[PDB]
Design an enzyme around this catalytic site. Structure first.
Site, short mmCIF file in Angstrom:
data_model
loop_
_atom_site.label_atom_id
_atom_site.label_comp_id
_atom_site.label_asym_id
_atom_site.label_seq_id
_atom_site.Cartn_x
_atom_site.Cartn_y
_atom_site.Cartn_z
N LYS B 346 -5.06 -1.14 -2.22
CA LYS B 346 -5.17 -2.06 -3.34
C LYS B 346 -4.57 -3.43 -3.03
O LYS B 346 -5.08 -4.45 -3.49
CB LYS B 346 -4.49 -1.45 -4.57
CG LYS B 346 -5.02 -0.06 -4.91
CD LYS B 346 -4.33 0.58 -6.11
CE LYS B 346 -2.81 0.57 -5.99
NZ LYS B 346 -2.33 1.32 -4.80
N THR B 347 -3.47 -3.46 -2.28
CA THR B 347 -2.81 -4.73 -1.96
C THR B 347 -3.54 -5.56 -0.91
O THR B 347 -3.66 -6.78 -1.05
CB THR B 347 -1.38 -4.46 -1.48
OG1 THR B 347 -0.71 -3.62 -2.42
CG2 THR B 347 -0.62 -5.75 -1.33
N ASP B 400 1.62 -7.83 -8.00
CA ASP B 400 1.30 -6.51 -7.47
C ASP B 400 2.36 -5.48 -7.84
O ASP B 400 3.53 -5.80 -8.02
CB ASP B 400 1.15 -6.56 -5.96
CG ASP B 400 2.47 -6.76 -5.26
OD1 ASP B 400 3.39 -7.29 -5.90
OD2 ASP B 400 2.58 -6.38 -4.07
N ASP B 401 1.91 -4.23 -7.92
CA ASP B 401 2.75 -3.08 -8.26
C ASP B 401 3.43 -3.27 -9.62
O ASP B 401 4.65 -3.33 -9.74
CB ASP B 401 3.79 -2.82 -7.16
CG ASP B 401 3.22 -2.04 -6.00
OD1 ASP B 401 2.19 -1.37 -6.18
OD2 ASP B 401 3.82 -2.08 -4.90
N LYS B 428 -1.15 -14.43 -21.75
CA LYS B 428 -1.98 -15.04 -22.80
C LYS B 428 -2.05 -16.57 -22.72
O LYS B 428 -3.13 -17.14 -22.84
CB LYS B 428 -1.49 -14.59 -24.17
CG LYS B 428 -2.45 -14.98 -25.28
CD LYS B 428 -2.05 -14.41 -26.63
CE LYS B 428 -2.12 -12.90 -26.65
NZ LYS B 428 -3.51 -12.40 -26.49
N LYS B 505 -4.89 4.72 3.96
CA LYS B 505 -3.48 4.61 4.33
C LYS B 505 -2.93 5.94 4.81
O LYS B 505 -1.95 5.96 5.56
CB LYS B 505 -2.66 4.09 3.15
CG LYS B 505 -1.32 3.52 3.56
CD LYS B 505 -0.57 3.00 2.36
CE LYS B 505 0.68 2.25 2.75
NZ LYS B 505 1.24 1.47 1.61
N1 LIG Z 1 -10.24 -1.44 4.76
C1 LIG Z 1 -8.93 -1.57 4.56
N2 LIG Z 1 -8.50 -2.04 3.37
C2 LIG Z 1 -7.19 -2.16 3.16
N3 LIG Z 1 -6.18 -1.88 3.99
C3 LIG Z 1 -6.63 -1.42 5.15
C4 LIG Z 1 -7.95 -1.23 5.52
N4 LIG Z 1 -8.04 -0.73 6.80
C5 LIG Z 1 -6.79 -0.63 7.18
N5 LIG Z 1 -5.89 -1.03 6.24
C6 LIG Z 1 -4.44 -1.01 6.37
O1 LIG Z 1 -3.97 0.01 5.51
C7 LIG Z 1 -2.82 -0.46 4.79
C8 LIG Z 1 -2.78 0.30 3.49
O2 LIG Z 1 -1.49 0.10 2.88
P1 LIG Z 1 -1.34 -0.81 1.60
O3 LIG Z 1 0.08 -0.90 1.19
O4 LIG Z 1 -2.04 -2.14 1.85
O5 LIG Z 1 -2.18 -0.05 0.54
P2 LIG Z 1 -2.14 0.16 -1.04
O6 LIG Z 1 -3.28 0.95 -1.52
O7 LIG Z 1 -1.96 -1.22 -1.66
O8 LIG Z 1 -0.77 0.92 -1.21
P3 LIG Z 1 0.02 1.75 -2.30
O9 LIG Z 1 -0.60 3.09 -2.48
O10 LIG Z 1 1.44 1.82 -1.77
O11 LIG Z 1 -0.02 0.89 -3.54
C9 LIG Z 1 -3.18 -1.91 4.54
O12 LIG Z 1 -1.94 -2.58 4.47
C10 LIG Z 1 -3.78 -2.31 5.89
O13 LIG Z 1 -2.66 -2.44 6.75
#
Ligand SMILES: Nc1ncnc2c1ncn2[C@@H]1O[C@H](COP(=O)(O)OP(=O)(O)OP(=O)(O)O)[C@@H](O)[C@H]1O
Ligand SMILES: Nc1ncnc2c1ncn2[C@@H]1O[C@H](COP(=O)(O)OP(=O)(O)OP(=O)(O)O)[C@@H](O)[C@H]1O
Ligand SMILES: Nc1ncnc2c1ncn2[C@@H]1O[C@H](COP(=O)(O)OP(=O)(O)OP(=O)(O)O)[C@@H](O)[C@H]1O
Ligand SMILES: Nc1ncnc2c1ncn2[C@@H]1O[C@H](COP(=O)(O)OP(=O)(O)OP(=O)(O)O)[C@@H](O)[C@H]1O
Lengths: 40, 537, 37, 213, 107
Positions: B346-347, B400-401, B428, B505
C-alpha cells in the site's frame, strides 16, 4: 583604542609628574637637614 | 571641482557576484541615482540622498563579498571597517567617545568644504552585537542603551549631515532597534536568498574560468549536469566543492607515508576529471538546510514489478486524479483513499504515485518520526505540516498508516480522540484562495474507519489487490528470477492444482528464508512454506 | 524558587593634585643657603 | 626528520589520510601551479567523538609536525573576565601577530597555528543561553567576525575539539570556517592489535616481556 | 619513619593493599628500571560508600605518610563566586605550582 591608550598613558604621565615632584621635595628636605646640621 | 562618484575603470563582470544581479540593480537604482545624474537637474529637484543600507540573510551568501565590492567600486576616502563589538571599553563613557570618533572627520569635512566634498564609508559588520533592543538587553549596565542613543543621535541629529554612507549586515534583523530602521537612517533592507539554477551555473563558471584558461580542466566536465545535481547548495558550498575536487586531483602525485615526496614530472601533467567531482559530492561535502532531500530509497527499496494487470490500473487512476486536480476551479480540494489487505504494498504505490506527480511541494507525514509523542505533540506536528503545505501554490501530502496514527488497539477499543477530530477538520477545510491541495491516505482496516464515520470525508477509494492466480505467481518469480527453469516446472506441476493467496511483501520473505537451505531441499522447503502460511481466502 | 544570578562590573578613575608640596618646599629652601654662607 | 612511524598513533590510517589530503596538500605542491589554479587554503578542522579515542593526541602530534611557530593553546574558558569588554580584548589578542606578519610579508609569511580545547564551552547557539547578562554572546560574534573578516587572512589554522558536536553554533561550521569534520570512534580488531603493539615496544626491546605472551 | 601500626585504621587490609599496589608502587622501585619500562604514573583515586565507614580518615592518613608538600584542601563548594569568570580562576590556581616545578625541575 590606540588613542584612548595614549590618553591613559597621559594620565599615568600626570601621576608620574606627581611622583617626580614628591621625589624632588624629598631631596630638598634632605638638603635642608644637611645644611641646618652643618651650620652648628 | 568635478569629482566623479564612480571608478572609471569598473565593470560589472569583474565584481563576480553571480545571481544577485537583480538585487544589485535595485541597490544601484535606489542608492546612487541621485549622484550619477548631472548636478543642475538634481539642484532644481532638490532631492536628498539615502544614508543607510541593511543587508540580511541566512549564512553563506554574498553579503560580505557584496560589501567589499561596493566599497571597492567607489572612488573616495577609504572605508573604515568595524569588526563587531570592538567598541566596548571598561571605563565609564568610553564607548560613546569611540563611536563619535568615527564620524568626527566627516562632520569636519562637511562643515569646512560645504556640499562639494567627497564620500566617506563606514561599514558596520555584525550590527546585531550592538543595536539590540534597549528594552530587552540585560539590566546589568547602561552602556548598551547609551551606545544605541549615541548612534541614533549622531547618524541623524539636529545638525544635518548628508555626505556619509553606512552599510550594515546581520543574521537576525528583527531584533534591531526600530528607531534605527526608519527612513533617513537604515532604510533600504534586502534579503540575499539561496541561489537558483542559473545562479549556480554562474557561480560555477566564475570559479572554473581560471582553470579553464590554462587547460587544467578536462574537456569532459559538464557544468550543467553539476548544476542540475547540486540542490540547495549555497555559494560557500559551491566553492568548497571545487576546492575539494582540486585537492583530490592534486593529492594523486604525493607520497606521505615515509618522508614526503612529489614527482616533478607528473606535477606538470595535472588535470581534474569529472570522477573527482562525483566522488566529492558524496564523501566530503553535504548540503545543510535545503528543502526535500527525500529518502525515497528507504520507502521504495525495490522499485516496482508489474506482476499483473492491477498495478497498471491503480497507477492510471492516480495519474487521472493528479491531472484533474491540476486544472480546476470549482473544486480546489481532492482527497483519495488507498486501502487493502496487509502486506500488499500500500505504501510503495502511494509514494510512487506521488513521485510521478511533479508538484513543487511534496511531503509525507508518517508516525515513524513520532515515537513516544503525547496526545498533544501529534496535533502540533500535523498542524505545522499542513501550514507549510498551504504556502506553496501546489501541494500534495501523504498520510500513511492511519490506524497507527490513532494509537488504535482492539481490546477496548482505545484511541486518541483529539487526533481524530483534528484529522477530520483538516481534511474538510479548503485551502487559501487560488492554491490547490491533494491528500492521499493509506490504511489496512477499512471497516474500522467506516465505524468511526470518517470514510465519508474522503472523496474516493482505491482497492489494492494481492496475488490471486498461480500464473501470476510464476510471472512474479520469473521477474525476480531467483530459480532455474527445472525448479520452475517442478513448482508449477503442483502449484497449478490450487489457487494461491499471498501478499508480495511476504513472498519476498519466504524466498529469502528458502534460499538459506541446501540446494537439494530448497524447492521442498519453499513448497512447505507456501502451503502452511497461504491458508486463507 | 527562581534561579540565582551573576554580574558584570565597571570601573572609573581618580585624578589627584601635584604642586602644593613644592610650592611649599621651594619657598622654604632658598634662604638657609644664604644663612649658612 | 619526520615520518608517520614515530608519532605512535595506530588504527587511524583513513582519518589521517583524509586530513592530509584536505589540509596540507595545497601547501606542499610547488606554488606556481597553485597560483595558476588560484585557490585559497582551508583554515579549519573539527574533531569529535566519544571519550578516550585520541583527539588530543592527534592535535598535539599535528602541532609538532608542522615547521611553524609554537601553537597558542587555550585550556577551556581562559578568556572570560569580570569587566565589560575584556573577553573581546583577549580574543582579538590571539590573532594579532598573524595579521601583522600578513601585512609585512604577504604570501611569504609563515604559518601560525591556534588550538582550541573544549570549544563547546564558549561557543553555543546564540539565544539558547538566556539571561546570563549577554557576556556569553559577544564572544561568539567577535570570533565569527574575526575569522572570516572583511579584511582577510590566508595563513592561519584553527583546530577544535568537543565531545558534543551538536550544540555548536551552525554559523561556525559552514565551509571556509571549520570545514573538515572527522569522527574518531572505537577501533576494530586490527587497530586494537596495532595499539597493543605500540604500547609494548619498549618492554620487548629489553626482553622484559616473557616469551609466553 | 612511617609504620603501618601508626596508621590506626582497622578492617581495611585489602582496600589499602590494592591502593598501595596501584598508586605508589611505581614510585618506590628504582628509577632506572622504570625508565626502561616507560609507564606514566596514575593520577587519581575515588572513594565511595555509606556513611561512617572511614573514608576521610583514610584520605588524611595517606596525606600524612607522603613526604611531600602540605596538601591543598577544597571543602566542598568553596570555589564558587558570583562574578562571571572568577569561578574558574579558583580552579586554575590550584595546579599553578605543579606546572611551575614541572617546568623548572622536570622528572
Ligand atoms: N509491485 C510492488 N508494489 C509494491 N511494493 C513492492 C512491489 N514489488 C516489490 N515491492 C517491495 O515490497 C515492499 C512491501 O512493503 P511495504 O511496506 O511497501 O508494503 P505495505 O503493503 O505498505 O506494508 P504494510 O502491510 O506494513 O502496511 C515495498 O516496500 C517494495 O519494497
Ligand atoms: N553569490 C555568490 N557568488 C559567488 N561567490 C559567492 C556567492 N555567495 C558566496 N560566495 C562565495 O562564498 C564565500 C561567501 O563568503 P561571505 O563572507 O560573503 O558569506 P556571508 O554569509 O556573507 O558571511 P557570514 O557568514 O558572515 O554571513 C566567499 O568565498 C564568496 O566568494
Ligand atoms: N589511538 C591511540 N593510540 C595510542 N594511544 C592511544 C590511542 N587512543 C588512546 N590512547 C592512549 O590514551 C590516551 C587518551 O587521551 P586523549 O587525550 O587522546 O583522549 P580524549 O578522548 O581526547 O579525551 P577527552 O574525551 O577526555 O577529551 C592517549 O594519551 C594515550 O595514552
Ligand atoms: N576503620 C576505622 N577505624 C577506626 N576508626 C574509624 C574507622 N572508621 C571510622 N572511624 C572513626 O569514625 C570517625 C569518622 O569517620 P569518617 O570521618 O571517615 O567518616 P565517613 O565514614 O567517611 O563519613 P562521611 O561521609 O560523613 O565523611 C573517624 O574519625 C574515626 O574516629
Amino acid at each position: 583604542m590606540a588613542e584612548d591608550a595614549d590618553m591613559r598613558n597621559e594620565l599615568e604621565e600626570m601621576q608620574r609628574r606627581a611622583d617626580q615632584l614628591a621625589d624632588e621635595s624629598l631631596e630638598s628636605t634632605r638638603r635642608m637637614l644637611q645644611l641646618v646640621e652643618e651650620s652648628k | 571641482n568635478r569629482q566623479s562618484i564612480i571608478n572609471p575603470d569598473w565593470n560589472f563582470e569583474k565584481m563576480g557576484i553571480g545571481g544577485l544581479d537583480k538585487e544589485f540593480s535595485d541597490i544601484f537604482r535606489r542608492a546612487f541615482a541621485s549622484r550619477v545624474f548631472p548636478p543642475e537637474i538634481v539642484e532644481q529637484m532638490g532631492c536628498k540622498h539615502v544614508k543607510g543600507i541593511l543587508l540580511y540573510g541566512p549564512p553563506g551568501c554574498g553579503k560580505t563579498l557584496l560589501a567589499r565590492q561596493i566599497g571597492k567600486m567607489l572612488n573616495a576616502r577609504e572605508p573604515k571597517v568595524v569588526n563587531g563589538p570592538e567598541i566596548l571599553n571598561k571605563y565609564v563613557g568610553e564607548s560613546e567617545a569611540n563611536i563619535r570618533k568615527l564620524f568626527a572627520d566627516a562632520e569636519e569635512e562637511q562643515r569646512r568644504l560645504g556640499a562639494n566634498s567627497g564620500l566617506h564609508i563606514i561599514i558596520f559588520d555584525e550590527i546585531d552585537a550592538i543595536c539590540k533592543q534597549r528594552g530587552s538587553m540585560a539590566g546589568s549596565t547602561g552602556v548598551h542603551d547609551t551606545v544605541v542613543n549615541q548612534l541614533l543621535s549622531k547618524i541623524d541629529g539636529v545638525e544635518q549631515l548628508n555626505n556619509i554612507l553606512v552599510i550594515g549586515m546581520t543574521n537576525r534583523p528583527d531584533l534591531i532597534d526600530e528607531a534605527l530602521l526608519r527612513p533617513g537612517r537604515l532604510e533600504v533592507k534586502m534579503e540575499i536568498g539561496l541561489p537558483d539554477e542559473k545562479g549556480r551555473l554562474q557561480i560555477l563558471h566564475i570559479h572554473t574560468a581560471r582553470m579553464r584558461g590554462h587547460q587544467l580542466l578536462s574537456a569532459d566536465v559538464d557544468i550543467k549536469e553539476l548544476a542540475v545535481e547540486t540542490k540547495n547548495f549555497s555559494g560557500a558550498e559551491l566553492e568548497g566543492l571545487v576546492r575539494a575536487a582540486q585537492s583530490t586531483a592534486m593529492n594523486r602525485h604525493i607520497k606521505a607515508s615515509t618522508k614526503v615526496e612529489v614527482d616533478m614530472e607528473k606535477a606538470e601533467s595535472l588535470q581534474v576529471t569529472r570522477g573527482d567531482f562525483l566522488a566529492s559530492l558524496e564523501n566530503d561535502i553535504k548540503p545543510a538546510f535545503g528543502t526535500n532531500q527525500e529518502d525515497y530509497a528507504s520507502y521504495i527499496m525495490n522499485g516496482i514489478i508489474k506482476w499483473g494487470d492491477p498495478v497498471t490500473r491503480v497507477l492510471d487512476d492516480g495519474e487521472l486524479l493528479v491531472q484533474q486536480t491540476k486544472n480546476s476551479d470549482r473544486t480546489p480540494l481532492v482527497s483519495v483513499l488507498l486501502e487493502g489487505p496487509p502486506h500488499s504494498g500500500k505504501t510503495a504505490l502511494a509514494a510512487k504515485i506521488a513521485e510521478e506527480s511533479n508538484f513543487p511541494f511534496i511531503k509525507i507525514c508518517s508516525p515513524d518520526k513520532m515515537i513516544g509523542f503525547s496526545e498533544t505533540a501529534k496535533c502540533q506536528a500535523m498542524k505545522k505540516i499542513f501550514d507549510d503545505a498551504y504556502k506553496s501554490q501546489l501541494s500534495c501530502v501523504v498520510v500513511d498508516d492511519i490506524e497507527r496514527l490513532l494509537d488504535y488497539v482492539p481490546i477496548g477499543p482505545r484511541f486518541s480522540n483529539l487526533v481524530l477530530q483534528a484529522l477530520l477538520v483538516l481534511l474538510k477545510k479548503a485551502p487559501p484562495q487560488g492554491r490547490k491541495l491533494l491528500i492521499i491516505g493509506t490504511t489496512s482496516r477499512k471497516d474500522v474507519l467506516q465505524e468511526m464515520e470518517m470514510l465519508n470525508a474522503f472523496s474516493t477509494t482505491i482497492h489494492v489487490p494481492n496475488i490471486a492466480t498461480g500464473e501470476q505467481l510464476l510471472e512474479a518469480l520469473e521477474l525476480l528470477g531467483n530459480f532455474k527453469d527445472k525448479e520452475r516446472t517442478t513448482i508449477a506441476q503442483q502449484v497449478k492444482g490450487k489457487k494461491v493467496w499471498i501478499g508480495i511483501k511476504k513472498l519476498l520473505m519466504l524466498i529469502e528464508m528458502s534460499l538459506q537451505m541446501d540446494p537439494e531441499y530448497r524447492v521442498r522447503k519453499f513448497l512447505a512454506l507456501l502451503r502452511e502460511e497461504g491458508a486463507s481466502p | 524558587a527562581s534561579g540565582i544570578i551573576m554580574d558584570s562590573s565597571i570601573s572609573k578613575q581618580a585624578l589627584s593634585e601635584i604642586e602644593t608640596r613644592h610650592s611649599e618646599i621651594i619657598k622654604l629652601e632658598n634662604s638657609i643657603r644664604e644663612l649658612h654662607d
